[PDB]
Design a protein around this ligand. Structure first.
Ligand SMILES: Cc1ocnc1CCNC(=O)c1nn(C)c2ccccc12
Ligand SMILES: [Zn+2]
Length: 139
């Protein structure tokens, strides 16, 4: 689990969005596994605006943060789970690292701010849904 709080928005994995997230829907993209809902409280996370390929992510299944190198956001085939059939996921970044399903929502951060959230994984790889292109999160 996990979310990003920036301005009047909450960014979550679309497969983990709650009934309240869907009732306050701002934008969602199934191919990205992202959903953004509106909030009453102002959030103060900072979204990175950069092309970094190194950063640190939180891994709840190890209670640890790990530094990784990751690929630029791209269209990648992702195997099925109970939440989606196998399909191409867009704006996905991969790194070598540990993850389990419940690690979704863990934040990846570089020196500039939040890069994305854990979304996929397996075989020693962890995939992150990028948020750096969503310029509207700051306005
Ligand atoms: C976005 C997406 O695509 C398909 N199902 C999902 C959503 C469900 N995701 C997973 O099942 C999953 N997430 N991570 C980090 C893992 C690590 C090891 C094994 C499985 C997973
Ligand atoms: Zn950066």
């Amino acid at each position: 689990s996990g979310a990003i709080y920036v301005g009047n928005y909450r960014v979550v994995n679309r497969h983990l969005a709650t009934h309240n997230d869907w009732a306050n829907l701002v934008w969602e993209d199934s191919s990205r596994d992202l959903l953004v809902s509106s909030t009453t409280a102002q959030g103060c996370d900072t979204i990175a605006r950069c092309d970094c390929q190194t950063g640190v992510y939180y891994c709840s299944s190890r209670r640890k943060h790990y530094p990784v190198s990751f690929s630029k956001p791209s269209l990648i085939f992702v195997e099925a789970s109970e939440y989606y059939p196998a399909r191409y996921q867009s704006h996905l970044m991969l790194a070598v690292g540990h993850s389990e399903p419940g690690d979704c929502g863990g934040i990846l951060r570089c020196q500039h701010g939040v890069v994305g959230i854990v979304s996929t994984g397996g075989n020693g790889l962890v995939g992150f849904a990028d948020v750096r292109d969503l310029l509207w999160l700051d306005e």
